[PDB]
Design an enzyme around this catalytic site. Sequence first.
Site, PDB file in Angstrom:
ATOM      1  N   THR A 294      60.160  16.805  10.649  1.00 54.89           N
ATOM      2  CA  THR A 294      61.254  18.075  11.120  1.00 54.89           C
ATOM      3  C   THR A 294      60.311  19.304  10.128  1.00 54.89           C
ATOM      4  O   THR A 294      60.543  19.489   8.872  1.00 54.89           O
ATOM      5  CB  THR A 294      62.588  17.616  10.777  1.00 54.89           C
ATOM      6  OG1 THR A 294      63.125  17.766  12.040  1.00 54.89           O
ATOM      7  CG2 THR A 294      63.484  18.771   9.798  1.00 54.89           C
ATOM      8  N   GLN A 295      60.248  20.381  11.012  1.00 58.62           N
ATOM      9  CA  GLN A 295      59.759  21.504  10.448  1.00 58.62           C
ATOM     10  C   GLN A 295      60.393  22.850  11.142  1.00 58.62           C
ATOM     11  O   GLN A 295      61.406  22.387  11.999  1.00 58.62           O
ATOM     12  CB  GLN A 295      58.343  21.803  10.323  1.00 58.62           C
ATOM     13  CG  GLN A 295      57.423  20.370  10.823  1.00 58.62           C
ATOM     14  CD  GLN A 295      57.370  20.541  12.544  1.00 58.62           C
ATOM     15  OE1 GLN A 295      58.198  20.359  12.910  1.00 58.62           O
ATOM     16  NE2 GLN A 295      56.243  20.430  12.832  1.00 58.62           N
TER      17      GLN A 295
END
Lengths: 5, 5, 244, 233, 195, 222, 240, 235, 231, 204, 211
Positions: D1-2
């Site tokens: 997740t970014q």
Amino acid sequence: XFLFX
Amino acid sequence: XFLFX
Amino acid sequence: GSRRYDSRTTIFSPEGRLYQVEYALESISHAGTAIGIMASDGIVLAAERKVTSTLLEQDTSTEKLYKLNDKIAVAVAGLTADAEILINTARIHAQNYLKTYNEDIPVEILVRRLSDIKQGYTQHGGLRPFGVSFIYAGYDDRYGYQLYTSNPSGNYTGWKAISVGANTSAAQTLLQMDYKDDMKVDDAIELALKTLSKTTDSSALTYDRLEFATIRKGANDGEVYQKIFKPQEIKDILVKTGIT
Amino acid sequence: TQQPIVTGTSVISMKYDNGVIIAADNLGSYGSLLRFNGVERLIPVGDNTVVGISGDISDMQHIERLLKDLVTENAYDNPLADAEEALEPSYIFEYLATVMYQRRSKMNPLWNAIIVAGVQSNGDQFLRYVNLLGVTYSSPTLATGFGAHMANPLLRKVVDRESDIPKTTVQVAEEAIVNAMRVLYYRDARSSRNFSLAIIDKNTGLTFKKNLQVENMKWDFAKDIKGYGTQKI
Amino acid sequence: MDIILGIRVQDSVILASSKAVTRGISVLKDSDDKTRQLSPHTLMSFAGEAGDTVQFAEYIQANIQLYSIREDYELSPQAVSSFVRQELAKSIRSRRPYQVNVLIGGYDKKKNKPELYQIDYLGTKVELPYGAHGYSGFYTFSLLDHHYRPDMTTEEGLDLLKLCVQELEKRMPMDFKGVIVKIVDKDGIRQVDDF
Amino acid sequence: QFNPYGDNGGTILGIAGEDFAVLAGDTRNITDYSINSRYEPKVFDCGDNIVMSANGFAADGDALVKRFKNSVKWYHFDHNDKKLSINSAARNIQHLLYGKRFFPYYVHTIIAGLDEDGKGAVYSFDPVGSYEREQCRAGGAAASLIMPFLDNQVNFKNQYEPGTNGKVKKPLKYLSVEEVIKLVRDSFTSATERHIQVGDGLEILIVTKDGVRKEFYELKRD
Amino acid sequence: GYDRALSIFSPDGHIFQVEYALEAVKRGTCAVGVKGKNCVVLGCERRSTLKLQDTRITPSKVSKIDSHVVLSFSGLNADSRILIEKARVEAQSHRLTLEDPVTVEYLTRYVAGVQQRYTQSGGVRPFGVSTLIAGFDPRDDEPKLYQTEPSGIYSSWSAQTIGRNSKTVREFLEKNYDRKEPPATVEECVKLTVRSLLEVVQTGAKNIEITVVKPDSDIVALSSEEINQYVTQIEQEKQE
Amino acid sequence: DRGVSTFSPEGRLFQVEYSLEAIKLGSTAIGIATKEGVVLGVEKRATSPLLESDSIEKIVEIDRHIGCAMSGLTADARSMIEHARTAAVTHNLYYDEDINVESLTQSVCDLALRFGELMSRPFGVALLIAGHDADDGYQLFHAEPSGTFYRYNAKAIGSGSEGAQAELLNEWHSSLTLKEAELLVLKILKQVMEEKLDENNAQLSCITKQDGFKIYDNEKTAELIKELKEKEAAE
Amino acid sequence: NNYDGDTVTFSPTGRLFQVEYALEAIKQGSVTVGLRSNTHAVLVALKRNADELSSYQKKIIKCDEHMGLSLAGLAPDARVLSNYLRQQCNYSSLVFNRKLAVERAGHLLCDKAQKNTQSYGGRPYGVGLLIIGYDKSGAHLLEFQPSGNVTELYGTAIGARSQGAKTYLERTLDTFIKIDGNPDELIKAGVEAISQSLRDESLTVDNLSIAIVGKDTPFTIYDGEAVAKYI
Amino acid sequence: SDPSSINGGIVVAMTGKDCVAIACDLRLGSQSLGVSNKFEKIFHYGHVFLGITGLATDVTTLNEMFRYKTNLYKLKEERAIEPETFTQLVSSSLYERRFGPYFVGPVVAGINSKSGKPFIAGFDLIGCIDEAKDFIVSGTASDQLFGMCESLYEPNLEPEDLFETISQALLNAADRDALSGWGAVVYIIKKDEVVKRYLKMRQD
Amino acid sequence: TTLAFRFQGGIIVAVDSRATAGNWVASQTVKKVIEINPFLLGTMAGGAADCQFWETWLGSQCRLHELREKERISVAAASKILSNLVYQYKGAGLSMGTMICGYTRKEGPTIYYVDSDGTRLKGDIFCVVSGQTFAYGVLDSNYKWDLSVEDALYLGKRSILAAAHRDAYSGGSVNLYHVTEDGWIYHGNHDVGELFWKVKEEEGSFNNVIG
């Protein structure tokens, strides 16, 4: 959403 | 906790 | 590949014997004689150092008698290095048991574990067995004073008096002759030394060629003392019993 | 997740009688900052496919390398690599679609929306969409980001249904795409005037146009607008 | 909430444990036995999180029963309590700790002495004349501090326990549906039917 | 944060006849207030006279349909080309869905076909693989609009014999394929009017002993 | 890890390591099992080559697996401990999950399963041990006696012997054990077991160990004097 | 020494060919397939009269519709049976149906060649797998430690196999009744067995669509033995 | 001799004896023929029974709708390799929406066989395969040897007495290659080819096994009364 | 919630002329509820004394752990561990649980058997060493103990004088802490004799 | 609403048939009783999928037990297989409230309540109404040991009706089972809509209604 008395 | 200048 | 060079240390002979266990026992038969004698009021451990020198520091030397805890000691016959691997394992198990149950380990439980480790090396892993036979001298509040032996097979048995290493056949005959059930520690000390004195391959039995230890309730009141004899103390008990 | 850092805006496309057109502006934005003005977001694969990519530019450059590596790998022990066993648009799409859905399912997505435009072996027009969620769909017109909201309505007035595709010439189709890019420049605060356009025709092959500019803009009416209601000067 | 009490008298240990299993506003049972026999002369009562309580007790029961068969000997209550504490002390720093509080009542045949051990889910262990877990513990402690004596008989112990339960019923807001009482002495473990 | 799920809308409807079954779905794919496609098929022939639709998150629905199609292929390989019965398919799909119990497929699954006695069958699944065989099932966004209509018009619920005053229920009867298709068309026409995510087109797959055939009808595009 | 295949087939279809394991059993001290109408007795030989032994602490030949099942063996003593430990663990594991103690057949099937596994696993040799497993199933009064061997085969026996000179004591049991009427009482069953060992043992002194298992976890080991009374009575009847 | 997975100059795996020798030393097992059912029979071969014969289990249930007889190192079969039962139940869990007899056999045979330097050697036991399914009806399979399986109208394995198979060659026809098949297994077992055949040293079993897999009572088998003796004395 | 103990040992003349012994297992196997035109590719396999009570061991395995093989040697090894092909065909379909090329299927089998000839502990595969398929470049026939060598051919045969069929095909090459849009005549040529490898025994209804794949023909296997037409 | 103040309790150590003193309270509680008044917090491995405050499960665990380690030490070294060496072993052992620490405040006291030099040390929960000449304090009433010790203490106190000082330091500190008291023990340690005294104190 | 109670005639098992997603009635035709084997029944409450999947899996584990041990699995053993499984998944969000009901020679008629929390309880009567589980019936007044099988069936049927009326998330139809020696017997599905009016007219109860 899902089913569940 | 702790020791810590 | 690598199969070519594998000795296969954990197979049966056509006669149903374990080659490596049998050959390890042959090794131990050449090691210095160790004797254990169990009396009503304590246990004696006597053992012969192998052809020593005048330049060996004896007072700081230990090859035969080792402390496992305050209540249990072992006499060694075989490879000293192999024994020390097993001794440190036993010392840890004893402390693990004490940590878990807040009670000193019963003698048999410690003996069974060390014996179960030896057994493993004969059934799996493809490694050589430990070339070591132990005499366990111990006290607990279930069975009191106890003598056991274990051999490279991992088999262990209990004894009133036993020998391991060199001239066990001769030693066991002499013990079986002079041992009585009502015997005391002072008498058992005399028997142990007299037995070594007759079975020894050396010309004479002297203080510098012996390791000696007693486990006595000869400790002020209701407790047990381990005494690893000093060189001068072995010399004194040799004069007292009239061997020198 | 970014989170996406350097980003590209709308990719727009449509089918016409003999092939497909796709277009995208040459901007890499850094939030409100229009940082990179020389970024190519249409990446050709052989002479039959163009992949248009919006979203995170670092993830686009990764996908660019996967496609470059796909062409190399296809050629290995393949005598018909430039003929019957060449990469099809449908093959290139399904691969990306597989990757996009796998990455979202490991909660580490490629933060992009992708449109694969091309022509198949039998001359059939190919145009399909995939995004960071692994969601896929096909339509006579496809667009990402703002394009979906502003480009699609204009392109759908040319090709509203499948039956309109044979009736749509390449000249009419390109005109529609170029107009849509102008509308996006008027109204998208993350668009640039400079864009690239690619035509994949079943007859004339792949035509790749670089350094195109939005022209014939209407601004003259601005001079007549004073204040926000009651001001006369 | 669950009541587990322990009182060590002159020649025995008595464990009283509530018979109600409740989840939220629902009463699941009114005849539950919150006890396991670890060995012939050692009894463990347990209260805490649903599932964990029984799973922990049965796991401890199996290990102590294995030791008994292997050595043909009964572990002393001190030894059993130390084993139980160490298992709980492991669990606090585990991925999902056992949320179980236990009382261990045992009769040591070697010393001919009854022993009561209170252990919480953290592995906090003390030997006490009387012990308890939860809300009930504070009332019962103050009452037992007054009345308890070291040379009390089993019958005197039961009467004091009877008073504790009576007073708990009046004072406690939840209905724990009575208690099951078990006595641990030299003859073994028996359940007192009349209570 | 990154949200791994989405809603692509659409509605699916499965009706089981005496010697046939239908699985219908709108061809509209949406995201928020945007229309992604006016024709993206959602109901698939999976082989062995089984039709399947997973409606909800399109990515999860596409993945599940693929896995089941693959599952049918390996059934043939490992079991000497044995035909996969609808009950066996239904159980297999439950295991597919429950596999991702702690990262669910956000889809409503309906499968239609013939049972081993040759009678029409419809199976309905929840996201985590709870399944049950039914005469009628609507899934997706407009399920709440359509299901009550089907209760009334297929199972004849709250309908009594005139002149009895509620004393005798209307007799249950097997509907013809022609009657069932009318109800499917009327259901979707009604759902299109009142649901923003439903419209564009309707694709119906009819399953008989003879095989799988396909009917398509246009819906309002607003 | 050591993977070497030690138990393999030979051209004549024999597994020599499994057959050489049986030779280890042949060398082992004699063990006999006899089931009566309402009991099972386990007799075991103690070789008198070892005196100055401490009989209090020396590992006994009969081991309790649970309160209702016992295991005796012939072969390598060290190997037997590993099977006994595994069996004792499985006994508690069964009680924990099934909420019921093991049947004698189940415990046998488990031990036999372990012995088999060690005949087709890499890096391991078979157990040089045959076992007699005896007891009563929970809430059952029917006596049970099973035998296992290194190969991993097991079977139920009216009476059986294993170890050195087992051929001789099996010969005795085959002519002296009637199936239609087994030893009715504990006395009769113990007597027949002691008699069977006296064919092989040497001296009836500290060379014979007897363990009687009755229904409902009733297990007791006879003392020297108790066994010596059986030895005395048998030879006084023989002088005729 | 030499590899466990080694090929001979004739192109056969030494260890597999050697395991086939172990199976020849095994007690006899016979299977006969009919349109009315499949019969399975075994020689028990107790080593001593003190051995309680009923404890000898060489015929085993895999599922309600699949039986199994074994010959060779029978201890090796326990893990094969365990796998077969797990496969049969697991397939019923995944597909809500009975598993095909061929599929079950194929599953067992996939273990066969999982040996090397996985298990240390091949299995020293052959299996006769008998069952019924809706697709291919009543079936009998022979599962070897090679990993190969053949379907058979009738088959004998173990010490008396080549003698028994020659007898089955003459006796089997497509119109055999179940009663005829039972007597035929008993007849051929009695021919190849060392000791005299009775209800205690031999065991019968069958699989029918209606009743599924059943191991015959000693009392039931005893009656079929008496019926055999009379019909052989009738000419 | 001294150099055949394992697959990791070369002989003084640079031979791998364990691989050559694996190659021997194929020659012992029952005969199977493969041949193709431009439109269709055919497998013909003589199935072998244990005795008269036994079934005839299946020789042909389907790998995909457009590809399958016939086996000669260890059947379990054919099952392992065919399962691997099924997976590789399947991976190509799911990931790339692409039917796996027959040539690339050959390359994958070769590389899988090779690893078992260079590593200690393992053994070579004891089976030979004839892979037929129809892909984007038309009909294909491949011959697999467990040495790892894979060869594309118009026709071939492997197993016992295979040399007879191989000689016939070498004569008929110019005829059977031209049999386009006539599946029955191509099978006839395959049945007439395998007939050159028969001795004593002839082709019966439960003896013969035929498979075909072509332009508008999925890979289908014919057994029983379905091949009575060609006897 | 705070692990180091659930059970409560205090330890204090002081140096004198050719002697050291270590003292602790006897309370164990579940926050407000007092459970046990027999929970001694001072242990000894030969002639080295260790007091531990904090989470009681860890006090017990660390006592069992250091008994284990000092037993193995003595068997291998063939002599009792000294205070200076044991201090390093405590520090080592605590810091190996740096990111999952024991919630304890240990205190070491003893006389070096060879040099005869009095030695005290304190630690934080991750094993940092405080080696003070004068006094060490630990527990829920550490602030109170620091106050008492800092005013009451003078150097080179005789054993019987040092006893009064450390006793008055503990007692008065404990009475100003809710989670400390319920009795107290004081160890006076000389080179080859150790006296242990239980103190009379208020039980509220 | 699931109900399982023990009496002289064996075990009565009564359940409703409604499945809900929030306030949405998804189905009125759900089988909340699972037939594990001819002598074993499992009721289901909580997550539909969790109950269906694991009680179907239990039937597989119970079948393997019979094949291995050649004996019918005890209710205690069967219940503990499910209870030990769910305990492994404890805190993962499994929602399960089930009663494992069977008869065996060893134990006689036995009901075990198994919870997703890992709670396993043996009792004479278990009830699951709304989200609460009780060791008492919905009515409990009528419950006497010596009761007619066909009388006991009615109490179970009546008890589900009582809950079905008041509870929004209970309804559809009542499924009845009778567990005895030599297996369980299905006593049919009764639509609550038709049942309510019939019961009202015959019993003269639900007066607060009107019809």
